[PDB]
Amino acid sequence: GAGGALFVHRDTPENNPDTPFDFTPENYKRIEAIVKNYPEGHKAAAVLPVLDLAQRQNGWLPISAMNKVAEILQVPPMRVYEVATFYTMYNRKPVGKYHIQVCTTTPCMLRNSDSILEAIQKKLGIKVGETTPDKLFTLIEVECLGACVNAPMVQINDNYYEDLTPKDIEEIIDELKAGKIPKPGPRSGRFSCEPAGGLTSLTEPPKGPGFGVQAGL
Amino acid sequence: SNLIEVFVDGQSVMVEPGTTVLQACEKVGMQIPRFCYHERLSVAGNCRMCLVEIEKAPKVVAACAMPVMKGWNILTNSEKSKKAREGVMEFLLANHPLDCPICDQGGECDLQDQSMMFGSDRSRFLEGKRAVEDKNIGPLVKTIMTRCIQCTRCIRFASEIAGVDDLGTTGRGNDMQVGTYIEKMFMSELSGNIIDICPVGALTSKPYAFTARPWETRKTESIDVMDAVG
Amino acid sequence: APKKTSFGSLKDEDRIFTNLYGRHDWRLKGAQSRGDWYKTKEILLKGPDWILGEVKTSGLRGRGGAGFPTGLKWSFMNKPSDGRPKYLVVNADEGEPGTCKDREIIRHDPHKLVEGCLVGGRAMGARAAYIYIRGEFYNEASNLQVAIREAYEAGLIGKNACGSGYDFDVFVVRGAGAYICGEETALIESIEGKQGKPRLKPPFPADVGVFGCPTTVANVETVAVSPTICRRGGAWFASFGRERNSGTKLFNISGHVNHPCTVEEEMSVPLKELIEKHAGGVIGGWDNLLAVIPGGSSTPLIPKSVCETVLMDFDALVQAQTGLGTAAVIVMDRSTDIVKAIARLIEFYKHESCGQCTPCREGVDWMNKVMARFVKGDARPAEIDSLWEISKQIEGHTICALGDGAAWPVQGLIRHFRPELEERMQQFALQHQ
Amino acid sequence: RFRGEHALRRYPSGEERCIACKLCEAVCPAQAITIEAEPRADGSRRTTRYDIDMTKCIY
Amino acid sequence: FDNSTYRNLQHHEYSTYTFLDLNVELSKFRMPQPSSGRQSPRH
Ligand SMILES: NC(=O)C1=CN([C@@H]2O[C@H](COP(=O)(O)OP(=O)(O)OC[C@H]3O[C@@H](n4cnc5c(N)ncnc54)[C@H](O)[C@@H]3O)[C@@H](O)[C@H]2O)C=CC1
Ligand SMILES: Cc1cc2nc3c(=O)[nH]c(=O)nc-3n(C[C@H](O)[C@H](O)[C@H](O)COP(=O)(O)O)c2cc1C
Ligand code: SF4
Ligand code: SF4
Ligand code: SF4
Ligand code: SF4
Ligand code: FES
Ligand code: FES
Ligand SMILES: [Mg+2]
């Protein structure tokens, strides 16, 4: 589908260069640590980590934060604009407290991700582009979060919830809005990508060090 | 010397190391079709109009970015090169707006001329076209970004020649757009050259808008007196 | 009996990733108990030439999906230094639909990846290793960071790595939601704080890479098997699988199977054996199978008539007009709308294009629109050949292989299910008068 | 199909159809058309001069 | 020895700053970075 969000910034009272943003001293220490991970003369390599840290501190990315990152890294603001508008994990508009991302790619689609999307829709009463009136949940559609084996799966604030049934995701939503912390992972009684059939492989105890080592080493 | 030997349609050419396929072709008097390549800007390699076939090579190469190897035979008018040019021009014209009568670039448009020379004569695109919003970058350069072909010539000129890093691209895919992402004026003493470098009518002269057509103007070569540069 | 003709049924002791399911301690102590970091100092002291020779004898091909010979690729960094530093880049972006192996390698066997990074960096003379992981894998990246900290404290990496006298650093760099950033040049751009747009080759990363320095980009699975290959030797790895298809492989089986899972199996195991052995078989029985995408969304699908006798290696699947890819098997039964699935894949590719070059940027969106119309049936039969020609134009005329990965599924669908498209068009024409 | 006296047409809203593209001037075998243009007060592409010399015209 | 239990649970208590705190901690173990000779490509 066509991307709803625009790629031109128009100043608003909520979002304009005079919007107050700054990094906390702990965040400045983290920025120093991040910058020391690249060779001298290549400070611009830290644009993505520092921008992500700004988003993690603020929740989203106002243009003031992007200008601040450009100023800290001595990078022209247009390059930071390019980075922020290229990568989809950056939020250039405010999002809810829990950003719900449902994978609808073909491997997840085959395992009825439509049921999960509809269950979330009828539990929250919002669409796949809206935010709840209490500003708690934002629901969007994403592409292949990397857990195709555990389809259908959903990501909520860098946490994975997979092997989902509509009732399971509704319960997760209830305990999320109740202030609890839901345990990330599959909900079907399997811990990880192992087969649910009974662990067809890797049954024997793992071999000790140097077991298969060749001679002359 | 240090020159190597290459062939352009079987004709021996002696070129320096690091010479591209396009330069070797122009040494024998052929101009490879190009949109994104400018000899005074950095090499981009994005428009893909310059794709050409090397003999005994299954895949066509980008003549603007590929250094030519010794013994290579560049086949500039083979079936592979012509079909690659036709496909690239088709993809370029799929979303282009039907603005030629109202475009100032009409009659001196590289897109028009290279469509007439290297592309097909009809369309098989049956979908709707994309439309983008315009950007205000000053009172000198008129901006109609629907005609943009995403060559990035303007960005490279602003970065390298004018020394101003205000131009760039936002988004990705079919939604990638050329602009400033904010209301900002590209006001520089050399800012007017982006109109010339732009192959299409996306960037045009605002004082000159709508007044004339290229074929009716008479050309007088003269010297500028606004400074001491001449 | 040399020259094996039947492949599969791999034993546990021959497996490399002995903690694929996270059933053991992923920390340093568990990895050491499982054989990791065992006389790796002796491996480093053997020199880059010995490691490169072992990798070449192993016959390992790139596990990222292209199957390039690992030894030949790594030998490109065996040049004398010209003043610039040398770097190793580990590709953990893992963008293909259907692929889940690298996530498990990172989350459950991180010390394996760290030791492989050290061994490969010593082999190619790299000063440090940058691990580029997708930003969606936050917990996986934090586990990797914990493992790297454990290795640093134990003296396994850093100054005087493992006592060998070779200095090596391991860095973790996180991207922000970009499937194109898995491509090696696009990944290099993403590391340097720029847009994830691929670079034209030449120059190759061995000449000009990250920060303009000689660089090698290698998949997580390719890196994590090198220490075990060097420990047991090239010959042991070589025996498994067909000739030029040596070693073990991680397989992700998803879609319409009873037990979708990630399993480790020998290379040339037949697809039917793998599906009926580890995945629990096709939902509704084997006779209910309609089509299989063997190597992730970029590889073309094959119908049931091909899946019952094909082998899961590069050459066998190439002979089947498809590719091994990332060994990501996606299974679809006869209840699946085959056109809708391919349309969803094309939508994925349309949303993942970086837009740098004309053929991908416009043609992929064009094919997305055409296939969206195809799903409803609004088009005409000549548009099938039109779409085939459009795909041909996109293929081989783009900067990177994302155009290839968008074109190939369309070609496979047109090749194997043209009557379905024609029938849907005829139904639309009937219903809409 | 009969060719008679020349005329300039309008859109149903009354807007001029002519957009000063100067194709007729270029194609005119007798050079009977003279066109000048500029942006209108509302920014529209319109003509300020559009003359046809009917004694030069060949119809 | 038993394979029944899942032993990857330390990631359930991870916070927003875990990765960057780990980077800060690791910053003292790293080697002096190489230098290109200038402060920036625009210098
Ligand atoms: N694991 C994943 O998440 C994904 C994997 N893929 C796979 O990636 C494959 C295409 O990737 P490519 O890099 O474009 O394939 P490629 O053949 O062009 O390159 C593969 C590796 O070999 C190197 N190489 C290739 N030719 C070389 C040469 N002549 N000289 C020196 N080095 C050379 C390349 O630098 C690269 O590192 C696809 O087949 C796809 O299956 C695609 C998307 C995602
Ligand atoms: C669009 C695109 C995306 C890719 N994404 C990944 C990826 O996420 N992970 C990966 O290992 N390789 C990916 N690749 C393939 C890389 O080129 C490959 O991993 C790299 O060359 C490493 O080579 P190796 O297989 O020898 O390790 C991608 C290729 C393309 C064209
Ligand atoms: S830019 Fe060229 S092709 Fe496009 S409308 Fe203007 S004259 Fe026509
Ligand atoms: S405005 Fe002109 S030069 Fe700039 S990207 Fe568009 S077509 Fe190219
Ligand atoms: S093929 Fe697509 S993703 Fe690859 S460089 Fe071209 S536009 Fe970008
Ligand atoms: S200038 Fe001539 S051809 Fe162009 S719109 Fe006006 S009348 Fe028609
Ligand atoms: S298809 Fe859902 S995680 Fe990839
Ligand atoms: S002129 Fe070579 S790709 Fe544009
Ligand atoms: Mg122009």
Q: List the CATH number of the domain containing A125.
A: 3.40.30.10
Is the CB of residue B88 less than 8 Å from the CB of residue C397?
A: yes
- For ligand 4, the distance from its centroid to the CA atom of residue C328, given in whole angstroms, is 40
- Min Cα–Cα distance to chain E from A75, Å: 10
Inspect the structure and tell me whether chains B and D have 3 or more CB pairs less than 8 Å apart: yes
Is the CB of residue C182 less than 8 Å from the CB of residue C91?
A: yes
- For ligand 6, the distance from its centroid to the CA atom of residue B134, given in whole angstroms, is 26
Residue with CA closest to ligand 2 atom 14 = C183
Is the CB of residue C60 less than 8 Å from the CB of residue C222?
A: yes
| Structure tokens that stand for C184 in this block | 């090696």
Amino acid at A17: P
Question: Is C104 close to A193, i.e. CB distance below 8 A?
Answer: yes
Q: Are residues A108 and A81 located together in one domain of the fold?
A: no
Q: How many H-runs (helices) and E-runs (strands) does chain C carry?
A: 19, 9
B109 is in an annotated binding site: yes
Q: Are residues A127 and A66 located together in one domain of the fold?
A: no
| Structure tokens that stand for A91 in this block | 């939020």
Q: Are residues A68 and A147 located together in one domain of the fold?
A: no
* DSSP reduced 3-state for E23: helix
Rounded CA-CA distance C166/C159 in Å is 7
Q: Are residues A159 and A130 located together in one domain of the fold?
A: yes
Q: Are residues A115 and A81 located together in one domain of the fold?
A: no
Is the CB of residue C191 less than 8 Å from the CB of residue A19?
A: no
Rg of chain B over all Cα atoms, to the nearest angstrom: 19
DSSP designation for B214: G
Q: Are residues A82 and A156 located together in one domain of the fold?
A: no
Question: Is E37 close to A41, i.e. CB distance below 8 A?
Answer: yes
| Structure tokens that stand for B185 in this block | 């004026």
Question: Is A107 close to C177, i.e. CB distance below 8 A?
Answer: no
DSSP designation for C300: P
Rounded CA-CA distance E34/E37 in Å is 9
E15 lies within 8 A of chain C by CB: no
Q: Which residues pair with B67 in a beta bridge?
A: B20
Q: Are residues A73 and A115 located together in one domain of the fold?
A: no
Residue with CA closest to ligand 3 atom 7 = B106
How far is residue C375 from each of residues C97, C149, C341, C405, C413, measured CA to CA in Å?
A: 20, 51, 10, 20, 12
A1 lies within 8 A of chain C by CB: yes
Ligand at minimal distance from the CA of C348 is: 7
Q: Are residues A131 and A71 located together in one domain of the fold?
A: no
Resolution (A): 2.5
How far is residue C101 from each of residues B38, B144, C64, C92, C316, measured CA to CA in Å?
A: 44, 47, 11, 10, 22
Residue with CA closest to ligand 2 atom 31 = C401
Rounded CA-CA distance A90/D10 in Å is 50
- Min Cα–Cα distance to chain E from A2, Å: 31
D48 lies within 8 A of chain B by CB: no
Q: Are residues A81 and A102 located together in one domain of the fold?
A: no
Q: List residues near ligand 3 (CB under 6 A).
A: B 96, 99-100, 103, 105-106, 109, 111-112, 147, 200-201
Is the CB of residue C133 less than 8 Å from the CB of residue C141?
A: yes
Pocket test for ligand 8, best of B25, B50, B52, B74 (most atoms within 8 A of CB): B50
Q: Are residues A52 and A111 located together in one domain of the fold?
A: no
Is the CB of residue E11 less than 8 Å from the CB of residue C143?
A: yes
Annotated binding site of C: 63-66, 68, 73, 91, 94-96, 102, 182, 184, 217, 219, 222, 326, 353-357, 360-361, 398, 400, 403
Rounded CA-CA distance C180/C171 in Å is 21
φ/ψ bin of B178: left (φ > 0), alpha (ψ from -120 to 50), beta (otherwise)? beta
Q: Return the residue of A nearest to C39 by Cα.
A: A217
Ligand at minimal distance from the CA of C358 is: 5
Cis previous bond, A152, omega within 30: yes
Task: Specify the DSSP element, H or E, that contains C402.
Answer: helix C402-416
Amino acid at B213: R
The residue among B143, B181, B183 with the most chain A CBs within 10 A of its CB, best to mutate, is: B181
Strands C169-174 and C128-133: parallel
- Min Cα–Cα distance to chain E from A110, Å: 28
- For ligand 8, the distance from its centroid to the CA atom of residue B8, given in whole angstroms, is 18
Q: Are residues A131 and A156 located together in one domain of the fold?
A: yes
Rounded CA-CA distance E26/C152 in Å is 8
Task: Specify the DSSP element, H or E, that contains C264.
Answer: strand C261-266
Amino acid at B4: I
- Min Cα–Cα distance to chain C from B144, Å: 19
- DSSP states of chain A: ----S-S-----SSSSTTS-----HHHHHHHHHHHTTS-BT-GGGGHHHHHHHHHHHHSS--HHHHHHHHHHHT--HHHHHHHHHH-TTS-SS---SEEEEEE-SHHHHHTTHHHHHHHHHHHHT--TT-B-TTS-EEEEEES--S-STT-S-EEESS-EEES--HHHHHHHHHHHHTT--PPPEESSS--SSS-TTT--S--SPPPPTTSSPPTT-
Amino acid at C71: G
D3 is in an annotated binding site: no
Q: List residues near ligand 8 (CB under 6 A).
A: B 34-37, 45-50, 62, 64
Is the CB of residue B69 less than 8 Å from the CB of residue B18?
A: no
Q: Which chains touch E (3 or more CB pairs under 8 A)?
A: A, C
Domain that holds residue A123: 98-186
| Sign of the alpha-carbon torsion through B34, B40, B43, B47 | negative
| Structure tokens that stand for B163 in this block | 């020394």
Q: Are residues A180 and A127 located together in one domain of the fold?
A: yes
DSSP designation for C217: E
At A74, which CATH number? 1.10.10.1590
Task: List the determination method.
Answer: cryo-EM
Q: Which residues pair with D49 in a beta bridge?
A: D36
